[PDB]
Motif scaffolding. Structure first.
Motif, PDB file in Angstrom:
ATOM      1  N   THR A  46      -7.302   5.006   2.295  1.00  5.67           N
ATOM      2  CA  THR A  46      -8.115   5.616   3.343  1.00  5.67           C
ATOM      3  C   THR A  46      -8.345   7.109   3.125  1.00  5.67           C
ATOM      4  O   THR A  46      -9.197   7.707   3.781  1.00  5.67           O
ATOM      5  N   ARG A  52     -13.227  15.906   2.935  1.00  5.27           N
ATOM      6  CA  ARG A  52     -13.453  17.223   3.525  1.00  5.27           C
ATOM      7  C   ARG A  52     -12.166  17.942   3.929  1.00  5.27           C
ATOM      8  O   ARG A  52     -12.115  19.172   3.945  1.00  5.27           O
ATOM      9  N   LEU A  53     -11.130  17.175   4.254  1.00  2.00           N
ATOM     10  CA  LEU A  53      -9.851  17.746   4.673  1.00  2.00           C
ATOM     11  C   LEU A  53      -9.060  18.453   3.568  1.00  2.00           C
ATOM     12  O   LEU A  53      -8.142  19.219   3.854  1.00  2.00           O
ATOM     13  N   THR A  71      -7.474  17.109  17.481  1.00  2.44           N
ATOM     14  CA  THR A  71      -8.688  16.560  18.068  1.00  2.44           C
ATOM     15  C   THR A  71      -8.600  15.050  18.260  1.00  2.44           C
ATOM     16  O   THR A  71      -9.042  14.519  19.278  1.00  2.44           O
ATOM     17  N   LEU A  72      -8.026  14.361  17.282  1.00  2.00           N
ATOM     18  CA  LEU A  72      -7.879  12.914  17.371  1.00  2.00           C
ATOM     19  C   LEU A  72      -7.117  12.534  18.643  1.00  2.00           C
ATOM     20  O   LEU A  72      -7.461  11.565  19.324  1.00  2.00           O
ATOM     21  N   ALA A  75      -9.032  12.180  21.942  1.00  2.00           N
ATOM     22  CA  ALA A  75      -9.890  11.008  22.056  1.00  2.00           C
ATOM     23  C   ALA A  75      -9.030   9.944  22.737  1.00  2.00           C
ATOM     24  O   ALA A  75      -9.503   9.192  23.587  1.00  2.00           O
ATOM     25  N   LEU A  76      -7.757   9.898  22.354  1.00  2.00           N
ATOM     26  CA  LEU A  76      -6.817   8.947  22.938  1.00  2.00           C
ATOM     27  C   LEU A  76      -6.572   9.336  24.391  1.00  2.00           C
ATOM     28  O   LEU A  76      -6.450   8.479  25.263  1.00  2.00           O
ATOM     29  N   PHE A  96     -17.671   7.014  21.137  1.00  2.00           N
ATOM     30  CA  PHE A  96     -16.700   7.316  20.092  1.00  2.00           C
ATOM     31  C   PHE A  96     -16.990   6.583  18.786  1.00  2.00           C
ATOM     32  O   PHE A  96     -16.769   7.118  17.701  1.00  2.00           O
ATOM     33  N   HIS A 100     -18.077   6.894  13.741  1.00  2.00           N
ATOM     34  CA  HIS A 100     -17.256   6.084  12.855  1.00  2.00           C
ATOM     35  C   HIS A 100     -18.100   4.993  12.205  1.00  2.00           C
ATOM     36  O   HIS A 100     -17.823   4.568  11.083  1.00  2.00           O
ATOM     37  N   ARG A 103     -19.953   6.485   9.386  1.00  2.00           N
ATOM     38  CA  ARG A 103     -19.090   6.700   8.233  1.00  2.00           C
ATOM     39  C   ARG A 103     -18.749   5.378   7.562  1.00  2.00           C
ATOM     40  O   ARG A 103     -18.024   5.341   6.570  1.00  2.00           O
ATOM     41  N   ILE A 105     -16.938   2.950   8.790  1.00  2.00           N
ATOM     42  CA  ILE A 105     -15.553   2.564   9.021  1.00  2.00           C
ATOM     43  C   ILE A 105     -15.640   1.222   9.744  1.00  2.00           C
ATOM     44  O   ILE A 105     -16.139   1.147  10.866  1.00  2.00           O
ATOM     45  N   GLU A 109     -10.895  -1.626   8.807  1.00  2.00           N
ATOM     46  CA  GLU A 109     -10.475  -0.317   8.322  1.00  2.00           C
ATOM     47  C   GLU A 109      -9.804   0.452   9.458  1.00  2.00           C
ATOM     48  O   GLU A 109      -8.732   1.038   9.284  1.00  2.00           O
ATOM     49  N   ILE A 113      -4.816   1.869  11.663  1.00  2.00           N
ATOM     50  CA  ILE A 113      -4.153   2.914  12.433  1.00  2.00           C
ATOM     51  C   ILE A 113      -2.991   2.340  13.240  1.00  2.00           C
ATOM     52  O   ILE A 113      -2.103   3.072  13.670  1.00  2.00           O
ATOM     53  N   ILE A 117       0.612   4.092  14.457  1.00  2.00           N
ATOM     54  CA  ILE A 117       0.880   4.201  15.889  1.00  2.00           C
ATOM     55  C   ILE A 117       2.221   3.560  16.232  1.00  2.00           C
ATOM     56  O   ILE A 117       3.015   4.126  16.983  1.00  2.00           O
TER      57      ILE A 117
ATOM     58  N   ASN B  99     -19.696  18.669  12.947  1.00  2.00           N
ATOM     59  CA  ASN B  99     -20.781  17.765  13.316  1.00  2.00           C
ATOM     60  C   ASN B  99     -21.998  18.474  13.892  1.00  2.00           C
ATOM     61  O   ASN B  99     -23.128  18.017  13.714  1.00  2.00           O
TER      62      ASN B  99
HETATM   63  C1  HEM Z   1      -6.467   6.149  16.832  1.00  2.00           C
HETATM   64  C2  HEM Z   1      -7.620   6.125  15.966  1.00  2.00           C
HETATM   65  C3  HEM Z   1      -8.525   7.163  15.730  1.00  2.00           C
HETATM   66  C4  HEM Z   1      -8.962   8.121  16.591  1.00  2.00           C
HETATM   67  C5  HEM Z   1      -8.604   8.270  18.076  1.00  2.00           C
HETATM   68  C6  HEM Z   1      -9.935   8.929  15.860  1.00  2.00           C
HETATM   69  C7  HEM Z   1     -10.523  10.074  16.378  1.00  2.00           C
HETATM   70  C8  HEM Z   1     -11.478  10.836  15.719  1.00  2.00           C
HETATM   71  C9  HEM Z   1     -12.137  11.992  16.305  1.00  2.00           C
HETATM   72  C10 HEM Z   1     -11.987  12.525  17.728  1.00  2.00           C
HETATM   73  C11 HEM Z   1     -12.947  12.508  15.365  1.00  2.00           C
HETATM   74  C12 HEM Z   1     -13.862  13.713  15.586  1.00  2.00           C
HETATM   75  C13 HEM Z   1     -15.254  13.346  16.086  1.00  2.00           C
HETATM   76  C14 HEM Z   1     -16.068  12.588  15.051  1.00  2.00           C
HETATM   77  O1  HEM Z   1     -16.423  13.189  14.015  1.00  2.00           O
HETATM   78  O2  HEM Z   1     -16.348  11.392  15.270  1.00  2.00           O
HETATM   79  C15 HEM Z   1     -12.778  11.665  14.174  1.00  2.00           C
HETATM   80  C16 HEM Z   1     -13.281  11.979  12.911  1.00  2.00           C
HETATM   81  C17 HEM Z   1     -13.054  11.202  11.783  1.00  2.00           C
HETATM   82  N1  HEM Z   1     -12.472   9.936  11.790  1.00  2.00           N
HETATM   83 FE1  HEM Z   1     -11.612   8.966  13.299  1.00  2.00          FE
HETATM   84  N2  HEM Z   1     -10.184   8.421  14.594  1.00  2.00           N
HETATM   85  C18 HEM Z   1      -9.273   7.374  14.485  1.00  2.00           C
HETATM   86  C19 HEM Z   1      -9.099   6.614  13.342  1.00  2.00           C
HETATM   87  C20 HEM Z   1      -9.837   6.746  12.183  1.00  2.00           C
HETATM   88  C21 HEM Z   1      -9.638   5.921  10.997  1.00  2.00           C
HETATM   89  C22 HEM Z   1      -8.640   4.769  10.891  1.00  2.00           C
HETATM   90  C23 HEM Z   1     -10.502   6.372  10.039  1.00  2.00           C
HETATM   91  C24 HEM Z   1     -10.683   5.949   8.718  1.00  2.00           C
HETATM   92  C25 HEM Z   1      -9.935   4.968   7.965  1.00  2.00           C
HETATM   93  C26 HEM Z   1     -11.245   7.466  10.666  1.00  2.00           C
HETATM   94  C27 HEM Z   1     -12.117   8.302   9.980  1.00  2.00           C
HETATM   95  C28 HEM Z   1     -12.622   9.496  10.476  1.00  2.00           C
HETATM   96  C29 HEM Z   1     -13.217  10.516   9.638  1.00  2.00           C
HETATM   97  C30 HEM Z   1     -13.455  10.459   8.126  1.00  2.00           C
HETATM   98  C31 HEM Z   1     -13.475  11.568  10.443  1.00  2.00           C
HETATM   99  C32 HEM Z   1     -14.053  12.907  10.001  1.00  2.00           C
HETATM  100  C33 HEM Z   1     -12.942  13.863   9.607  1.00  2.00           C
HETATM  101  C34 HEM Z   1     -13.466  15.216   9.173  1.00  2.00           C
HETATM  102  O3  HEM Z   1     -14.184  15.277   8.154  1.00  2.00           O
HETATM  103  O4  HEM Z   1     -13.164  16.219   9.851  1.00  2.00           O
HETATM  104  N3  HEM Z   1     -10.849   7.676  11.988  1.00  2.00           N
HETATM  105  N4  HEM Z   1     -11.934  10.592  14.430  1.00  2.00           N
END
Ligand code: HEM
Ligand code: HEM
Lengths: 145, 145
Positions: A46, A52-53, A71-72, A75-76, A96, A100, A103, A105, A109, A113, A117, B99
């Motif tokens: 993954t 980008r990170l 930030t993540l 969302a929770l 939300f 995704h 991307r 996802i 995929e 998570i 968790i 974004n």
């Molecule tokens: C508990 C599960 C997760 C939560 C609550 C979560 C939350 C978020 C939030 C709030 C963002 C920022 C807003 C956006 O760009 O949409 C984000 C970005 C992102 N998420 Fe999720 N996400 C979760 C799981 C995942 C998983 C499992 C993947 C991929 C396997 C994923 C891939 C991405 C990517 C690539 C970004 C952009 C990161 C960056 O370039 O800064 N997310 N996610």
């Protein structure tokens, strides 16, 4: 569908989600980063989505990773706050999902998570009962992907 | 650059931000929607960025608009929570800007949210003192765009 999945969040599932979040959400930064590092450790595949990170192994020291992790957690927080109203929970979950979906996802995929968790929960004395409650919440999002 | 803008967030500014957020953030759905509908009313041109939301004239009844509005408030919640640690505020602000930069939203365009914020604050009886405080927080984001 997302509406059928939201209906799976029964009375006690919602209660377990709140009780556990009360603890986990107390330290968004620490638990958020732990969640991400665990995801990258248990599912290295993954890491490609997070190019980008930068160097994700730096953990807390990586400003971008820290910013994303915090930030993540909000969302929770959002999901937990919408538990009282299914209509609001659904519209917030679809919102939300947009980025995704863009991307690419997939539901499978995203489901990866769950492991991270469960481990973070366990680290704070919350067992399978809670991991399963959270798997149900995650399932609502999966239904939208 | 963002660090310098964050420097304008003095003790008094942070105090007014937290006090006003204690009220505004207590009804994220209501105030969130009020904020977007006011934005569309005062600057109709901004609607061009929200084609995905559909009929925004429906306001609260529009699930997509409601979903976006509620979610917008959790970004502010995030910012407010990081006020005492410039390092965390900065990484969260830069993560947030990614974004919006992709959407080609300039600092000037983003600043159009100041009017709606001032009006929402005023509806809860928070005067110019508070509007200025918020303009300064928005400025931190503008510095990242
Ligand atoms: C508990 C599960 C997760 C939560 C609550 C979560 C939350 C978020 C939030 C709030 C963002 C920022 C807003 C956006 O760009 O949409 C984000 C970005 C992102 N998420 Fe999720 N996400 C979760 C799981 C995942 C998983 C499992 C993947 C991929 C396997 C994923 C891939 C991405 C990517 C690539 C970004 C952009 C990161 C960056 O370039 O800064 N997310 N996610
Ligand atoms: C205080 C100001 C604002 C806050 C806190 C805010 C917050 C957010 C958040 C959290 C998201 C979801 C994550 C993402 O996709 O980046 C978002 C999406 C978005 N924002 Fe911002 N935003 C603000 C102002 C603006 C302004 C002024 C514009 C444009 C004039 C803008 C345009 C967008 C658009 C087009 C989306 C995607 C909407 C959708 O299709 O669902 N934002 N914003």
């Amino acid at each position: 569908s997302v509406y059928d999945a939201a209906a799976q969040l029964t009375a006690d599932v919602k209660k377990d989600l709140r009780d556990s979040w009360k603890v986990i959400g107390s330290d968004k930064k620490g638990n958020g980063v732990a969640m991400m590092t665990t995801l990258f450790a248990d599912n290295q595949e993954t890491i490609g989505y997070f190019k980008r990170l930068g160097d994700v192994s730096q953990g807390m020291a990586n400003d971008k990773l820290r910013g994303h992790s915090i930030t993540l957690m909000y969302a929770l927080q959002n999901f937990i706050d919408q538990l009282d109203n299914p209509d609001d929970l659904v519209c917030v979950v679809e919102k939300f999902a947009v980025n995704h979906i863009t991307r690419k996802i997939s539901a499978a995929e995203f489901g990866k998570i769950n492991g991270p968790i469960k481990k973070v929960l366990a680290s704070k004395n919350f067992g399978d009962k809670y991991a399963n409650a959270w798997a149900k919440l995650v399932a609502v999002v999966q239904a939208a992907l």
